[PDB]
């Protein structure tokens, strides 16, 4: 501990006193889409990314625009055997200022970027009219309904959203409690009277193609998951938007006296009610068909 603390304390100090160097911006000739300025190459726990020096300027002159740096993945040819790694090294550009090889990244469907291996100790950079494809980030592959391009999952200051990789389209979906993705955005209603159980939050009611679901108000942090009970809806029936009221009319309990929950029948695009015992389905369901509620075995 004595040795360790000697090192830790020294590391805590300013770089000039021998402290740990904080991350370092290395600029490059690229135009920030928000302000055109030169752009620099940056590392975060998320990966390696392209940033605009306005990040270091106070609010008045602050710029939070960022670009993701998609690397060119080395594709070693198994048929080349021992050659496969050597040719990969041959494939790389070499830095002007030093013998060190360079590693390659995509900035536009027209542009490609080379960065030295000893970055940021070495500041060599190169920019090429090279065109390849670019991904906004990575996660659950989704297809953008507005342009057919791939859509991925992204994280930020607002939790989790879903966005399309085509730079020409900003169509962004979103994550929801009990489904892969949610079309664009939808119509929510809050309830302060339903407390969460795994967390201290409160529950809110949401709608989407997935169905109608409850969710916790600190959604990115709580991420708590359940469908609403019919008796719950009946208790907050006044808050329910005009369409949703019918769900409150639905039979609250099954013939065994178990309690009922609200589910979405994807095959028929309609809400239904079902009952569970010991958390397992009772094999009973009721549906809404032409202004009436009908019930039977699943």
């Amino acid at each position: 501990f004595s040795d360790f603390t000697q090192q830790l304390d020294k590391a805590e100090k300013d770089p000039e006193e021998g402290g740990m160097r904080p991350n370092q911006m290395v600029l490059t000739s690229i135009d920030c889409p928000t302000c055109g300025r030169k752009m620099g190459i940056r590392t975060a726990s998320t990966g390696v990314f392209l940033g605009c020096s306005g990040y270091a300027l106070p609010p008045k002159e602050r710029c939070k625009t960022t670009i993701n740096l998609v690397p060119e993945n080395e594709v070693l040819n198994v048929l080349e055997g021992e050659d496969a790694e050597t040719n990969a090294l041959r494939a790389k550009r070499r830095c002007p200022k030093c013998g060190t090889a360079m590693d390659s990244y995509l900035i536009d469907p027209k542009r490609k970027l080379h960065v030295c291996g000893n970055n940021p100790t070495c500041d060599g950079y190169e920019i090429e009219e090279g065109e390849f494809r670019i991904k906004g980030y990575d996660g659950p592959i989704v297809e953008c309904e507005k342009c057919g391009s791939e859509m991925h999952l992204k994280m930020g200051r607002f939790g989790k959203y879903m966005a399309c990789t085509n730079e020409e389209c900003k169509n962004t979906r979103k994550i929801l409690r009990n489904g892969e993705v949610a079309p664009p955005k939808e119509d929510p209603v809050p309830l302060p009277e339903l407390p969460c159980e795994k967390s201290d939050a409160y529950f809110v009611l949401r709608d989407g193609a997935a169905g109608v679901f409850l969710a916790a108000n600190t959604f990115p942090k709580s991420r708590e998951t359940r469908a609403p009970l019919v008796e719950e809806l009946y208790r907050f029936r006044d808050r329910l938007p005009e369409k949703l009221r019918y769900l409150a009319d639905a039979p609250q309990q099954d013939p065994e006296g178990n309690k009922t929950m609200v589910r979405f029948s994807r095959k028929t695009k309609q809400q239904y009610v079902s009952s569970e015992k010991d958390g397992k389905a009772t094999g009973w369901s009721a549906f809404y068909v032409d202004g009436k509620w009908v019930e039977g075995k699943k």
Binding site: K267, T268, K269, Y288, D290
Partner: protein, 38 residues
Amino acid sequence: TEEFDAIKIALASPDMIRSWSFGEVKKPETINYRTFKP
């Protein structure tokens, strides 16, 4: 109507059947029960 003279039969080329169809059906769905619409 069409005043045909005879009837002919043969195997179905995939391009021919695809030319018949006015679209592809890709899901097991039939009709909605909230509103009786396909």
